[PDB]
Assembly symmetry: C4
Homo-oligomer: 389 residues x 4
């Protein structure tokens, strides 16, 4: 009946599943209406996986595709594609207008959620199947926004992280608890809770969720939020490892102080992701990504640890380079593939493609999942934005 | 088994679901065969919603797309798209040739109905699943025509409003009662029944339907038709509110006399729509749309009331501007999304796009549904017809 | 379980269902890969109807589409489209290579059949679901060929008419009896059996089939073949009505002699079609089509009769002009839409489109079904072949 | 429940099913994004057949399609199409990144497998449904690679042939045994086991599999591998017939010595295929293909035998020319169509299309299945690579 977390399929590393690269088809002579997009992610039901992303109501090539750099507008929608379909106009399915998104399947229906509206009074609407069942207004009146990756559903209830407030300062996240798309409760995030953008969330066992977020103001350490779905509580932490996962970031280990010490820099950031191995009782290993560059959104490097990331300052263990440092690499996202026997967690990579500041902007998506013992290969795009017509 | 009206999902306002904007993809350099169309509407089964519209047997860009301004021809067909698929040639499904349309799902199969033929001897054909099961000839021999929005099915019977006669004068509507697409009875509309074009109809409780129509000859007040499906009776009214919903219209409240008093102007009009909240016994709130302009089809403004619209002359309560007054806004349509637990009603907006008189003509469709407490955002097209190639 | 003929849905005339017109989208500026084709027909299961046709392994516009006039080649395939999908490359489903085709659903699976090979040693292959289950070699070594319209399945067995031999002389048709695509018997056509091309076949009651064919050598009267599926017998007749249905043809009634008298002319011909009303015991009315012109394949006119067409020389009763006489009109085909309550028969029209002799060739398909009391409207293409790019 | 081999449908020859020829649509004026590809094959479930192939993350026409000659890269993916859909961008489904592929349905889910990574440390990943369940690293560190045709599943276990090592020398194949995509055992190939590339495998009865492979270093005779799935053993043989099936090859019968004698030449080769007739206990006839030319990959000729191909040096019996000798013909592949009553085996043909050395490269796929008594027709492409735009 309801989706719930199972023990994960055996795996000790990350290996490539697939890559979608629609703008390979947007060169001179090509015959395709490709869909430029940003903030992509994947979510799955027991029947299918889907690539969700935020579009711009436009295809490339085309005269209107110059707006694709914008973060928020009346054009953007949460749309999706069967996973493995290329990102073309005829493959696209529009779910909700809006400029920040999440989605997740509870075992019976999809919940889709976007934020729509002006920056000072935006509204999250939640769609369950075909109906808008939930509505959640801005509480801080400063760009209400959500994860840009899948939410987590356990036992008929789905858990969505939202935040509202200055992107350059204190902004308190909330956990929304939904049932059939209706917001039935809010969970207050206690502890280290002054930031937490764009959380990537995975169940750590049968009843707990862990979210890896972005602190856009205070620290190059990533916030971690843990949700006890049985108690209905959530607590914020700061990831303690010397291997800081955000971008930009200082040199590894150089932030002096306790685990929850911010560090001197910390302005800016990027959405990050992780994957894991777990039993029904505990997470046994975590897999992390960060950029190659400590200053720019370029490259992707995988790491792993069996330590508790909220407690240990130990460096993470190098797995290897999934995207070379010369290649733009922007957001990354967690997702889980539910199975009949075991579940599997994965990391997707937004390999960014852009002509420059306030010019055409999109991406290619590469997907790596927890399986095997060593990284198999790195990913490239072989797309030169100058060639996009 | 059969579709029947349930109590609606909680909601106290209208908020945006999504928007389809196919001709964003019809600019220079684009690679899409988009489908120019007019009179769009949405209807849903328990399995899916579909965007229905009347096409012109042509895609844009293309040499033949200059006929898309025509109301009636041998080219037009009732076609549909899965709701959320963009309006492209490969996504299109053709149901019936004809130039006026309606469709509705009874819980087992779709009923599709169009009027086809010459103006003086047109025939409505009704298709149930794959078979043409019903045929209804013109009775006034002057453009037999129907709702341009979904019909309503209750307990295995569907209810369709048709009209026939001068668009500039008295034309008596009829309610057709269908079963598996066969016209099994006609219901005579009593009361205020001298007009009633393009009705948007929704169940007001378990057994009654209310239709909001267009009086194209006599009044800027919209006719309302109520159907008792158990008694098999229908009565026409004139909407009494000082907030007149048709376009063009005089200033609010300025029509002197009783509720059913026509007013001095009233020539012309536009299809209108409403949505509602209801229990199994009664409608508890109604939501209405009209243009911003009192003379031109531009803008869309939402209103609400808990009054009986056939009795009270009270002004409606302003919800807000869904489409700015500088933006063309033509037809609007009601539809209902059936649910396993509750039903939901919505308003769709035909945001018109045209190069001018007897030139290329189509639209973008914006959808708002009953949910939340305040209007979230207004809709734009960002399509300049001059840019369509 | 198995498909079998039911009594037909009430109807006393022919009225338009829909029209597919893919090459409306093949003009300058258009963005569609349309599928030029000839010999189209429709067949249905209980789940869906499909438009079948013979393609040329090419789309229009395109450099190779100049071969589309050819009757037979190594390029042609039996392909199909969900009925109502337009005839574009992405909508197409290829079933079997070959240059003469038929298909029919037995209630469990599709049987598809084409003839493939050189003119003097062609082979019919029959595909049941995904497997080639049947193979039937040429017996007269002179263009083995079949109906170019749907076959008929009753009680798990399907009935296919084939012919082999000179198109300008005596060629004896055979009825193939298939089960799961395997040819399990051949039925010898007795009686008037010296010709019978391209039969359009419909059940006349629970156990009999009637086929309306083309005599390409001897007569402007159409051969009729009746199959008793219980006895496993088939007999050929010549349609007796003074209203001769083939093209070219002499003036009505001018063939002197008995019903089976050929008449002096008779060379050439065109595939024809009919529809009917029936109970489980008998056919109660038949509907026929022929061209407007008695010398050229132009126009389509509908007729009806309650007489036995193998016995009565009475003129048929005029229903009216479905396609004006200025419009090319080539093949027509019978098909049946099975229903849960009643079946429905229909006639489809190949409205031909061509640039001329040995130049680009295709069509638009218009569909009329048995329903209502009067013809509703005639069909046009509004496609000028000169405009096809 | 589980797929297992049934007795095959009656048939004594090979006859054409269908052909897919996407680049017919890639000429001047065309409107299609076609998918250039190599190493195509077909695999089927009980629900559908699919055309699998290895793409290049590009469509034709398009600026990037010049890489399509490459064997291995970070661009290639195992993708598939419903069998009968043409090979266009919107029809494509991406399964796994990688440059060598196989896939097979076990009755419940698809197993897809590709090799990904650098030549010296490639990794096979196996995807079962939506999850990566298996991972198998290179064991000889020299282009780990697999069949380029479907694997075989029997009783819930699937059998995949892999090889690793010098393509110009001794390279030992292994049989991987998978369950839900997990590699549960490896079977050592005994006997004649020093080579065995790109095996085409079919069940020979209820519990045994036979694979026809390519010896790329030592012999123009094809290796044959037989797997006893009950014992879990596999043995390699050399095909003994005087009719040598590889290309290039010496004149028939001219290799002096025993069945397992290599012969003096043998460098190079091409993937080959066979089909068969079988009961539940034994294979009763085998059907083979080889090129027309003994030196170039051109033409295709069918043969048959009732002898044991590992024992008898008798020449095979000529069936006939399926592809004329002037037409490029590269890989061929075996596949089986499972049925409710009987199974059917087939041979597919990669009719190669290329502009030349290190230039644009793709193919057309022709399919022949075991049915009938004589070859019906040969296949052509009628594609001139010079015309591809
Ligand atoms: C202003 C707050 C930002 C999040 C920390 C901002 N989010 C939204 C909803 O606008 C993101 C940020 O500006 C962009 C990025 O860092 O790449 C993407 C952008 N995200 C979206 N456009 N959805
Ligand atoms: C002449 C009667 C009119 C309805 C009041 C007319 N309806 C039809 C069937 O022609 C509508 C009207 O002329 C147009 C409009 O007002 O926008 C649309 C147009 N509707 C359609 N073309 N379907
Ligand atoms: C030579 C015998 C003819 C049938 C009487 C011929 N049939 C075939 C299989 O070639 C038809 C005829 O030449 C053409 C026509 O009359 O329109 C179509 C053509 N039919 C097809 N090309 N499938
Ligand atoms: C180097 C080993 C070769 C197999 C014997 C080589 N295989 C791979 C995985 O590269 C094949 C060979 O080079 C090409 C051919 O012979 O056509 C195809 C090519 N196969 C693929 N590109 N998948
Ligand atoms: C999941 O983990 C949390 C934190 O370690 C623990 O309190 C809880 O009991 C665990 N749940 C189960 C079902 O073991
Ligand atoms: C629906 O409303 C009508 C009009 O108010 C009323 O007569 C009827 O009884 C109601 N139906 C139900 C089931 O309450
Ligand atoms: C169908 O019609 C034929 C010919 O008139 C007749 O012989 C047969 O009995 C009929 N079948 C049934 C089931 O009535
Ligand atoms: C299949 O064939 C092998 C080899 O001939 C034989 O050993 C085995 O018994 C056969 N299996 C069955 C089920 O007959
Ligand atoms: Ca930061
Ligand atoms: Ca009016
Ligand atoms: Ca004739
Ligand atoms: Ca060799």
């Amino acid at each position: 009946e309801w989706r719930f977390p199972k023990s994960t399929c055996p795996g000790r590393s990350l290996q490539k599943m697939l890559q979608l690269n629609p703008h390979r088809h947007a060169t001179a002579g090509s015959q395709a209406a490709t869909i430029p997009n940003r903030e992509p992610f994947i979510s799955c039901s027991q029947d299918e996986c889907r690539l969700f992303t935020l579009d711009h109501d436009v295809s490339t090539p085309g005269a209107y595709d110059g707006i694709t750099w914008e973060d928020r507008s009346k054009r953007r929608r949460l749309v999706s594609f069967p996973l493995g379909s290329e990102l073309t106009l005829d493959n696209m399915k529009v779910h909700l207008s809006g400029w920040s998104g999440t989605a997740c399947h509870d075992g019976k229906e999809w919940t889709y959620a976007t934020v729509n509206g002006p920056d000072n009074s935006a509204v999250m609407r939640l769609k369950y199947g075909d109906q808008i069942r939930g509505s959640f207004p801005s509480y801080a009146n400063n760009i209400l926004r959500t994860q840009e990756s899948e939410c987590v559903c356990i036992d008929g209830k789905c858990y969505i992280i939202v935040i509202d407030g200055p992107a350059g300062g204190t902004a308190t996240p909330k956990v929304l608890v939904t049932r059939e798309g209706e917001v039935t409760s809010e969970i207050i995030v206690t502890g280290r809770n002054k930031m937490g953008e764009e959380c990537s969330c995975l169940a750590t066992n049968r009843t707990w969720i862990e979210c890896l977020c972005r602190d856009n103001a205070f620290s190059a350490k990533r916030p971690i939020i843990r949700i006890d779905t049985v108690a209905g509580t959530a607590r914020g932490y700061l990831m303690c490892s010397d291997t800081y996962l955000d971008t930009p970031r200082p040199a590894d280990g150089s932030i002096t102080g306790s685990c929850e010490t911010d560090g001197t820099s910390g302005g800016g950031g990027v959405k990050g992701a992780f994957a894991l191995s777990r039993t029904t009782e505990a997470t046994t290993e975590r897999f992390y990504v960060r950029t190659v560059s400590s200053s720019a959104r370029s490259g992707a490097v995988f790491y792993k640890t069996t330590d508790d990331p909220t407690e240990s300052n130990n460096p993470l263990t190098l797995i290897g380079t999934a995207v070379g440092g010369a290649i733009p690499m922007w957001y990354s996202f967690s997702f889980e593939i539910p199975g009949k026997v075991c579940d599997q967690t994965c990391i997707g990579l937004e390999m960014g493609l852009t002509m420059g500041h306030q010019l055409w902007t999109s991406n290619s998506v590469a997907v790596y999942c927890v399986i095997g013992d060593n990284l198999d290969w790195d990913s490239t795009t072989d797309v030169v934005p100058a060639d996009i017509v």
